[PDB]
A paper describes a structure:
The most well-studied baculovirus is Autographa californica multiple nucleopolyhedrovirus (AcMNPV). Baculoviruses have their large circular dsDNA genome packaged into an enveloped rod-shaped nucleocapsid. The BV nucleocapsid structure consists of three parts, a central helical sheath containing the viral genome, an apical cap and a basal structure attached to both extremities of the helical sheath. Herein, we report high-resolution cryo-electron microscopy (cryo-EM) structures of the BV nucleocapsid combined with de novo modeling and Alphafold predictions.
The innermost and lowest portion of the apical cap was identified as having C2 symmetry. Like the anchor complex, the C2 plug structure also consists of two sub-assemblies. First and intriguingly, the peripheral part is composed again of Ac101/Ac144 modular assemblies, as in the apical and basal anchor-2 rings, and in the C7 plug. In total, it is composed of eight such Ac101/Ac144 modules, of which four are unique. The latter are almost identical to each other with very slight variations, thus the peripheral part of the C2 plug can be considered as arranged in a pseudo-C8 ring. Interestingly, each Ac54 dimer binds both dsDNA strands through ‘echelon’ arrangement along the two DNA helices. While all the four protomers use Arg255 and Arg308 for dsDNA interactions, only protomer-1 also involves N-terminal residues, Arg45 and Arg47. Sequence alignment of Ac54 analogs from 28 other Alphabaculoviruses showed that both the Arg255/Arg308 and Arg45/Arg47 tandems are strictly conserved suggesting a conserved way of DNA binding amongst baculoviruses. Our observation of the Ac54/DNA complex being located at the apex of the filled nucleocapsid suggests that it plays a key role in the regulation of genome packaging.
Numbering used by the authors:
A (entry chain B), D (entry chain B): 7 to 184, 190 to 317, 335 to 365
B (entry chain A), C (entry chain A): 17 to 317, 335 to 365
The structure:
Amino acid sequence: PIKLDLCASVKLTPFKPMRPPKPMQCWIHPRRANCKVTRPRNNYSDPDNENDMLHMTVLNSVFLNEHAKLYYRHLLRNDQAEARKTILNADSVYECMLIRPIRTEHFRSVDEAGEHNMSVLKIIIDAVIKYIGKLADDEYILIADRMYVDLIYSEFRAIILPQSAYIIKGDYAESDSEDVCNELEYPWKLITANNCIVSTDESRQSQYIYRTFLLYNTVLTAILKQNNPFDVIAENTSISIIVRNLGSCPNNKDRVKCCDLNYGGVPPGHVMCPPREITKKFFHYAKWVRNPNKYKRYSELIARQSHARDVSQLHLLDWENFMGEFSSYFGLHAHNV
Amino acid sequence: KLTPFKPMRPPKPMQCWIHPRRANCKVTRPRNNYSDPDNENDMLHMTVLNSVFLNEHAKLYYRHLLRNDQAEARKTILNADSVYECMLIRPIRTEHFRSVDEAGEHNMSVLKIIIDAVIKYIGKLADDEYILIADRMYVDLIYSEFRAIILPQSAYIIKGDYAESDSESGQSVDVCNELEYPWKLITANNCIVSTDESRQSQYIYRTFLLYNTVLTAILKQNNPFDVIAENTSISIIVRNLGSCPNNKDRVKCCDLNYGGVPPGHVMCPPREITKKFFHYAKWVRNPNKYKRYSELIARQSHARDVSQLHLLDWENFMGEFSSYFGLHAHNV
Amino acid sequence: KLTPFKPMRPPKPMQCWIHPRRANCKVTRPRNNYSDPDNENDMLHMTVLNSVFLNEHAKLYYRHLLRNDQAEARKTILNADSVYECMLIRPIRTEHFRSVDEAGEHNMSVLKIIIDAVIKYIGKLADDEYILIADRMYVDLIYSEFRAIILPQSAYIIKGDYAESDSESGQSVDVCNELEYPWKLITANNCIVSTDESRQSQYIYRTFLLYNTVLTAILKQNNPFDVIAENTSISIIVRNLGSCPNNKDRVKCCDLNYGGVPPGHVMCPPREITKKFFHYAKWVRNPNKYKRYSELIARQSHARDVSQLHLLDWENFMGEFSSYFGLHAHNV
Amino acid sequence: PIKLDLCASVKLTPFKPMRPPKPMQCWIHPRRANCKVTRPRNNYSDPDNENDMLHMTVLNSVFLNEHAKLYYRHLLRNDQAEARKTILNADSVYECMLIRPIRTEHFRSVDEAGEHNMSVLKIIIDAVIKYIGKLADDEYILIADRMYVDLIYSEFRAIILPQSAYIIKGDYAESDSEDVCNELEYPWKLITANNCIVSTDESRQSQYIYRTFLLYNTVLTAILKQNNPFDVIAENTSISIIVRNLGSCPNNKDRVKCCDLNYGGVPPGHVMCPPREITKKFFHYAKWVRNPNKYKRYSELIARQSHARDVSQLHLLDWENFMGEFSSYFGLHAHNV
């Protein structure tokens, strides 16, 4: 249903510039329809090309940028997938993945892994942390997909996946004014610029903590052989009820009852138990996904003050302590931070 | 439901002295270093369209024909679904382009050059390729006393294919499988079947688009043959205007109002040709039902005589027009 | 969210040879007993508008002026929010009404009678009452060589009130408390404050609406002074047309295209008068902010000299027009 | 937000042709905002005029008919309210009620009455039954307000109230073709007619049973001193869960557990226990309110066949037996039927 602004708003049938694949399915992603995997009929003289794994992912076209370029690709760098390219078909969109796993390499979806092989787990955390490192401090991001990043992973690699996210370039005009929203060529800048917002300290902290929670949710998903309900961004779903069901950390009320979760291998204990109120505020920050443009309601949210300011600062510092102990738990380094 | 996040400020000042009557035409000039008055002579028009006109490659469709660009710049930029073709311009001191809309242009030579530009623009369209306009039954543009600058056009491309007996001779590499070996192995471009008769339909279509554009240019009144709306019916418009006096098969455009001196009968195309033209045009509503109009104009629904003589009448109009402006008949 | 139930079949055939270019004008004739050819001479036009134009009494606003109806029938009927003014017509055998749109009318007398009809139609509007058009800067209608038939107009009425020292003399019964004793005791009509200066604004408004209508009638081209859209700005249109030669305070309508013989300068109203007219008109977007434009045209924002001389120039245009068509200056 | 179809779809501010009463409240209808009551400052020389009760009710404008005339008024006849008239203000609408209760008459809202004074109760049932009698057999109606009719009632009268309903004129073209959808004057009929539908036996039975259930729900509300949840037409609300909570009639599974309800005076017993599946099908029929035009989904619904046809017929006949015993319970007469 598309119309023009002339004296007759004509109904336009959404044109289909690409045969939509009828056999839509990915065995690595059985629960996902938009996820489709497939192995091409490579030149059969060469057994090597047999390994080439190809996965297309479906998604809306809004996720493309002003340049018609999909947002996660901006954060992509030194990618591991053998190749990638975008696919625009009307509102729908597709994103095919060329991969060539080595003679024995075998990827698999991060979801529901449970995997306790901290070597592979650390491979994935390195991939995701380096990827999100491409984010700028005054640039921020939300993930309308879920509260984590999808990916697959083999013993040799951890291939990232396309994400339903939205870039948002905030701008903190430092009092000492000595990347700008008006980066076009001067003529074009005369008309318009990025749909920027007002950056500030609190927004920086909010986005940083948000990406950190994304990291931790992905880590959970990796070490959860059961459902990791944290991903769920359902409108009806509320974190209040979520932690009411899950309860709080037995070892300390402050944190969540993540000690009792179901783990593919060794349970780590109350290690996976983050403070609760920080998670709550994180979910509130995440709710931004539905109205990204209205930034005043979510930009500083994780770092906002509910004295209330003292409690917010203290509990954010508690979450920072949690990140410190987490990094120590995996021998990590905050140079990415 | 999700908010369609906007990655840029939507330009509110929808002001185009070239095209005020529209809701998407905005022209505006730079305010750069004035030591160079020519830099001030620069002009900058952005038009707001819909992203649906972006192909698989994320390419605005009419840009497939932006070849030998006489204008300065043409770049695409979008605010979510909204899209924006942004134009750089720089005429010489006395050169100033103007809207084709009801231009009333009397200068024969200016019309000649403009029509040459439009015909060459549309020429590169492939034989099995078919174009459909989505805003008006005439290509839109501007024109200065010296040169002409095409304007962005909202249209959809489509590729066709046939299986002629001699399916080998000539360049057959142009196929709707325009991906790279694995990616084509995954999916192929949307495509249809092309055959000579729909090609004649398309020829008639493009030529009458050219005719509509020239009418608009030389008209000191509106061009009723330029509206692609629904309630508009070629039947009612014909009833309004009627058969042309010296040739009733034609239409009474002789009485119309041109800024240039009225040539009279010269601008009077046939009747059933325009009928089938309009019915072919109303296809655009749902191109996916392509066959419902793929062949419409030249269909044999005897009727063989009727449609072939209709083609004869159309090509008679084509040749007499071309001669009327010195155009070679071989410019098709 | 509830479905806006439709109590009638929505008439799909939006066909009006009188007004094809619009999306709501449908005309059509009866197919009744043909033994009476005059019954066939009957014509039947329904226009589709929005129910918002129905008052408290559920009365279509412009119908307040459907007095001494020269047309046959005018009834209202709605399909939920959609509304439908349905017209009966029956000209004499050779009488046939036509669209005011770009009528190019040369016949002076026909124009005279049409303008008489329009002025009398608008005359009954009360002094403290103010009208606002919602579709165009000109009253819409049709006209036969003999008579004229107004067409439905989408406009909002509003009543005003003042507290002059002599708040007793004359007929003061007309108040915005137009309910019956208890029902008025419950609620009152929406109302505003009327004062002489906004009344002058309204006089200028209505008169320039009349001027736009006459231009449309005698124009063999469109009437750019008839569009109430947003991006349209009187500033840009003025820049396009410019100061009239024999009187630069006026506008260069002399060069415009009339189906009747161009009178030239005769149709050239002042400049700032049209400016303030347009700014007054753009009020209609949100009438509830009434004061933001209630006084606009005749505001004293010295400026006393400026606005009073603007009124003088406007009334000069009014009188010279009236004399140009024999109209008495007392027909205001 | 209103636009025209010309080359510029202009945003139009909804014009306000009437001061909306700021003190919006009815003491007889404390839970209803659209309900407002008020006593006018009558000529104080006459104590008689003091009794005059005036109640305006707010509602959407869609409820008006093609003639801009509100639907319940069509069913109104020999009305008891001292006077009535409609009030169009933009989309909003109002409906003022003039009443002159006699020197001692005292009206009151039917809701939450509990009243056991079968004399007054029978007054109300007579009012409602005679009112709904104005419905034609081939004409049908739905009540988007709720699953009943609002009203007030004094010892002397039972004043009806405006309803958010929608008239629907079906048409059963009897094979022996010897009120028509095309009732306009011939010219106008040449363009259009009523938005009719295809009547039939089953639709007649469905509408009849629907109005009967409306009667019974109103009677319940009258004899319920507590909430009568049956009125509720909430989208989230399902009759399945409703009767799951309420359970079925202890005296017979067939019916509903209406024996246990809360009654202003004497409980009547399992008398108020209707068959359940009939109520279910009634609620499904009622769901039509949201898309009245699409009649194929609801018109025959109460009388439709789920053998399944045998069960539907049998259980509808059981509901008819329930109406028979109900009428006997109040000495009524089916001449209205």
